[model samples]
Target: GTILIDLSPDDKEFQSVEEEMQSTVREHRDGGHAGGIFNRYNILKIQKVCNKKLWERYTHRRKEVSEENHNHANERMLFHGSPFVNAIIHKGFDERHAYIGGMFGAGIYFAENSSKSNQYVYGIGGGTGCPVHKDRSCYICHRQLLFCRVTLGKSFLQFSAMAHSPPGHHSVTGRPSVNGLALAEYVIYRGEQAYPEYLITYQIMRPE
Candidate 1:
């Protein structure tokens, strides 16, 4: 959820990568990542509990969203206190799978021989916008909704995407992983003290 440009190491390629990441975050944070027009380029992030039964149950919620439509839009944003346990999603934007949609699907592996002690699977799925809503007051109808599903290990409960756009644009800050953290530093290089200017204020609808 954050981007930066670390000159401490001062590697040109790294600096370049940092700069690019910052730009991407700024764009998404600016609202370019939302709205129906940019739905294909949207990204999402969520936090979950680190447990197996909780994660598999989480998968049931994910099943609500597919190439088809469903009512889980609100729950999609409420990953944790649906008392929701585990799982994450990072979908794709383009047909080629070249664009990263976020974390793309993860869940806690329950098998006894799992790799890590609390490993979870983070599942990710991506697509265009949600179907046009019938309820005018509905957030999905009033605003935009980006679609994606991601899964990680049961041990891994929190996951997110830092960048939603391509090379030159900006995105949101403080994403879940290393690339996301790196992107936070990258934004600093492009002349930002904290978060990008445009992301100053906004409201995102969440489930009750």
Candidate 2:
């Protein structure tokens, strides 16, 4: 079992991720090509995950990938915002439990932009109230996200849906959303290839 340690604002790692969340917000059309909205969330809490099993598996997978590909293991820290919060930190990522029907594929997904990750965390299948944020000013409105370490040993670019990672590649990369099917997505086929590092609690900022 792992305990979630609350991160302090004074901590370098805390401010780093806080800035990470704040930097990516922007006005953009939603998935399925909906209307434009600016998703700017304010950081409320950042908790470090202390799970030894998950970390060990991720490292072992990283090394396995690195050894297989002549040491090109491209380990990356990515974001995955999900409504099923505890399942990730507790049990770890399992493709069997992952959401199907993604434009990029049917694998576990990650992204660099917090706004893109916010989709699953807030708007879709996350909160019960008006997910559109027209009533964000109401009390008890919050969103959760995970900062994950992804072992992308060798990533391949794909603009269309791919049920699996391409042969000889470790993962899939969708072109950036400035103009792409995926607003910015990363796909990994296996569970051990990634680990949840931190839990981020945030909320849509109310305009004053």
Candidate 3:
């Protein structure tokens, strides 16, 4: 079931978020682009959907790093003007307990429960690179493909679950990127239970 809801050009919430994003970009100008990298992309305003407390803590943590170096440290600071246009957050799982990837994206796509089988789990690729091509058999045997577009300075978020798999073997999946930040989290499934394992948040600001 594919449905689309068109919004007017003068949507208030849209205007507010657009302004916020513009300000964020302008904030980086004073620093003269980290490491002299001159291209930039919009920061995903995930606070719109993610847990506000968690989101605040994440932002605060980054700020703390900036302040520690008197705002002069050159690495790991969020968005320092690079020629990239994407960010990613991803997770994957097995057949037992259900796993949910956090909400952040334009839309969601679905696929079959095939972990052992090498297939294309429906999702979006990150960055301003060319789109990858794959065989149709790699996706689900369905016709519904949810699609949405994010304006240059605005985005939406959505969550997804992994393909259910059998025991013994495991599967690995996460958001992909041609260029930009990638914040990935993973959990191991043993028996019929799931537990948090590790979180690796990394960013590649400038391509040396």
Candidate 4:
């Protein structure tokens, strides 16, 4: 393996390269290319954070799920759906402009300030604006239920799961129930990898 390269995060060159890559990201609003680059960056970031040894150690839980290929399982199980897929526009942010069968709903579009900056909800054919108080309390998780944590980073963001849900909505009980589908984001600080153990979870439910 004479040609093998060691690009550890602590290496000055690696750090310089990573910073340049991040800077390049901010310079343009790349459409199709942006999504792939972002996903790859995220995966690399995760791998870097946890170290290769730990990464290999934790990569095998999928056998219990009947998933034979470790690589495919790891990729497929990076949350209920891929973040790359979620980045695409799935619905209208405004209730007035809301389309049926979309991820966002009518209530949000009809609301005065309904936008991605503001919180909203969507159902099979309709949805509504989530009040500011409700948004502060729960919208982040409702918007995307997987790995929905209270504090995200330096902005001091905080949240808490309020309810799990009833039998009609989720297999779990309470407001924060998993409906069979879920979505989430994993941040890599200093290039540590996010373990698949952290990625997989109970499937969240979607509106019927």
Every candidate's CA RMSD: 20.0, 3.7, 17.5, 18.5
Give the distance in Å from residue 124's predicted Cα in candidate 1 to where it truly belongs. Answer: 11
RMSD of 3: 17.5
Best by TM-score: 2
lDDT of 1 by residue, 1-208 (tens): 2222223325554344323222332222323222211212111221112334434443553443321233322221101110012111121112222212223221111111111100111112112323354221223332211111222111112334422222332221223463332222111111111111111111123324
- Using all chains and alpha carbons, the TM-scores for the candidates as numbered come to 0.18, 0.84, 0.21, 0.19
lDDT of 2: 0.74
Clashing pairs in 2: none
Candidate 3 Cα outliers beyond 4 Å, as residue runs? 1-9, 12-47, 72-208
lDDT of each: 0.22, 0.74, 0.23, 0.23
**1-208, model 4: which lDDT tens digit per residue?**
0111435567775565444333322211222121211211221421112234434433433232124322232222122122221321221011222223222211111111111111222222112222233222221233321111111112111121312112221111112133222122222111111232221111112213
Order the numbered candidates by lDDT, best leading.
2, 3, 4, 1
lDDT (C-alpha) at residue 49 in model 3? 25
Q: Which structure among the candidates has the greatest lDDT?
A: 2
Candidate 3 lDDT by residue in tens digits, 81-191: 111111111121123222344232111222111110011122222122212433222121221111111111111121232433223222222333431332321222221
Clash count, predicted structure 1: 81
TM-score of 2: 0.84
